[PDB]
Symmetry: C5
Subunit: 250 residues, 5 copies
């Protein structure tokens, strides 16, 4: 009996559609009721007993019920400002700027913890940033992970920290992963700064740990830049920067 | 000529659009009809015979039909609460969670049955989980499969169990497959825990069967973690679980 | 003068939006017109000459026009059932006992006609299936082709039969193609059973033709399974049926 | 203060939403006004002076204002046909006709002009086809280009003519390109007949030029087939090459 | 309470939906109120005291309230022109062209600054172009970057300047990047002219710098063409280069 309807509404999301009605209808009435019963009589003391409704002026054999129209004209004017004003405030609820929120996604699988450095270095540059952290097991998980923070968690940018293995089985998963991040960003129109450190890039654990931490730091700086002082980057445009050690120019 | 209209509605999904109308209109009237015919008279015994509608007060040459307005003002107030309240309950029935539902997709093609272990180990960790199982022939099929459970079957997460072959012809299908899973996840914003065991990773049938079952178990634990105690994982962050 | 409007409607697809209105409005009126002019008088013979509209009861100085409210209350009840019931029948859209429809896409480029066997074997397993066939020149064309049948031709599943060449130039086009089929499935949430037979998999024309026809058959069976007895497949789960 | 509203409408595209209202409302009224003031009186000469509105029949102590209901019933009927009929005609813009329109996209980069042959051979097979031609610089450009003609230029099918280079640097661009065409088709549900001729497929300029032209011709034929006599292709369902 | 409702509106963006109502309703009324109270009486001086509402003519035992209908007919006519005209002016706001605006995206990572030349050469060919410039660290960042200027910054076309490294680790990122640009273009139906110069394409810093700048220039010329004189490119079609 009742249920089909309820499930029906859920599936087609009709319910919020209808709430527009009620508001449209109800506010339309409240607005005129006010104008007609209170506003108009105040406006028309010259017409007797609030006869504005039937107020009339004759032009030869022409009879124009101006009062009725005037009542509508002033109604419309009052309804207009309501919509003009209701539209302005929905505009400001949008143009505020809350404090940029960064998302950090890392792995259990990962040997070194880059998240730490990164978050530190980010808080340092701008103590005002909000940081959301989430961790997934494998690199295979960064994409969905990031895309979620970006859409569902209101992050403005995200860092994806990963340690693809040394095996060639690991290399394919790393690329494929990276590529997911690509789509992620494109679907969201937001950046996901990728920071992957292959175990094989460094010869031993001492370097692996040092290297990963330096890069993490370096990228965290970019998150800062892209995010706050983008002018800066253009100044460094085509100036041959790089990740650690030597760089380059002309 | 009736038909064109019906198909028309189907194609443009106009029908549910209209149901909003009816509800908007009909609930608007019922709410006021009640206020006007029953509420107001009760509210206004002082006005004679429910004359509230025409109730009026004069201020010098000014005549303000307050009754009518009061009837609307009280109508509006009753309608507002109707909408405030209707909005609150759609917040609780929507926002509130259910017993997490996991999806498990596997293959006929696959040598070893990893679904088993996995489902067991999952029920163990959290006896309260719902499990949907679907099986397709080839690995080429996991994607659509998973994507379906995720969307059509309300699964919160999915495990795709596969056994790509040893041949290089198998390899390409495995990668391509994996890649679809990537997309699937991104299109759904839900995880699909991939668990592929190449026949060549293990030397013989004894290992192949042992190795597959161990991983299936291990990933099933992750499904648990991501799903229930995600805090845990962060604790394990950059801790080199390899 | 008139045109801008028409193009406007086309671009924003406003027209079907509006048909919701008409229906909402017109059905709202017909429902009440009936209730008020016919239903109510029948309901109220006690009130004289259908005075239910103005029917009233006094409680001290209180005057409650219950007739009007009762007419709305009964109206609302009649409109509700209309919407409860209209919602139920749009739910039964999932009749799907109309007969699963399969799509078969093949190539002119292809040496062997796999379509034939496949169609046969399908009609055999389930004489009740509807078969749509479309053919494109190159393998490059299967994707769009399939995705079309899936969406525009109501097929529930599709088989894409192809014969990628022996050349490495062919190998890249085959991979790229397959991958398209990937997306096609993901975008549609329907399966496309891929069945590609590389000219090089078989040593000669006799084998090529034999091999291709066997596979086409074998996959046609799967179309059957996934489509009708999916419980079978799970039974065969992890049974290395490869 | 008028502005916020205007920008507001633009951002949320509310304006066209509203035009639905007006039409819904205005057509609802015009339809009944006609029925009630003109239709009904004609229908009811037996009732005096168009009293159909108040027309009534008694059944014991029951008083049923059938005139009012009948006027709505006949209104609803006239409104139904209007919506049934308005729905039919919106169904017919999307015919299984229109003179088919083909899109041809080529490159400056490309050494040989395949577009020429292709268009000729297409005009030959069916002088009734409309041909849209757009040319981009690099093969990298065909995708967007094609996806455009398909969507924005109402083309039913598109041919993407290209000549990837001999360098392995060229090879990656060609693959990547092709792959773009893939998506293009899938996003549009329309065919893009790819026709790429690698400079290295042919040994010299004489062959390169000949070979490209032949293929271009050959694919053009397919555009024709896929487009007009699709039955034919199924008959060839026969190792053609 | 009040809040749930507010958050509710935010989440489902119901608020702007409703504004359609108000406008639909309010304008419907203002339009008729005008017609009925002022228009009609002017139209009907022959009927006494604005009796047009009840104006009537008999045909035998037929009574047709033509006045009421005429008032709606003329109402509908006035509402129609309102929607016809309202639809026209949203058309001129919808397809008014200022404008062309190009977007330029480059890298810090990149050795040489191509953006400079490109922007010069574009300003030269058409001093009337607007140029938006944004810079990201790595090549991995061009995609999102470009897709942003295209959608969010109203660019009509975008140039993506990059210098993938010499390492094979760099190669893979470059391809992957390029590929992103693919999608980007397809999703937006706008071009992103890619301009990548691998460090290894040139033997030394003198060449690396020269080569990059020349190409940047050359491509910038294409942005011009595709953008302003596209009939030029077709002329150069299949003319190799």
């Amino acid at each position: 009996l009742f249920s089909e309807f309820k499930e029906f509404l859920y599936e087609y999301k009709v319910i919020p559609l209808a709430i527009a009605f009620i508001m449209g209808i109800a506010s339309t009435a409240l607005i005129k009721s006010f104008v007609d019963n209170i506003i108009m009589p105040i406006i028309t003391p010259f017409v007797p007993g609030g006869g504005w409704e039937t107020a009339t002026v004759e032009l030869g054999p022409i009879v124009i019920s101006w009062g009725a129209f005037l009542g509508e004209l002033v109604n419309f004017i009052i309804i207009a400002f309501a919509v003009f004003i209701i539209a302005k405030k929905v505009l400001q609820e949008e143009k505020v700027e809350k404090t940029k929120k960064v998302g950090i996604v890392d792995t259990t699988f990962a040997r070194v913890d880059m998240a730490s450095i990164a978050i530190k270095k980010l808080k340092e540059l701008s103590p005002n940033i909000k940081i959301i952290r989430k961790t997934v097991p494998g690199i295979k998980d960064l994409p969905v992970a990031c895309k979620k923070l970006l859409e569902e968690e209101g992050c403005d940018i995200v860092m994806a920290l990963g340690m693809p293995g040394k095996a060639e089985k690991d290399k394919v998963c790393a690329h494929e992963a990276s590529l997911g991040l690509m789509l992620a960003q494109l679907m969201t129109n937001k950046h996901i700064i990728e920071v992957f450190v292959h175990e094989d890039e460094a010869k031993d654990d001492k370097e692996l740990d040092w290297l990963a931490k330096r890069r993490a730091e370096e990228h965290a700086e970019n998150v800062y830049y892209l995010l706050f002082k983008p002018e800066y980057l253009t100044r460094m445009a085509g100036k041959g920067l790089r990740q650690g050690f030597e760089d380059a120019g002309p």
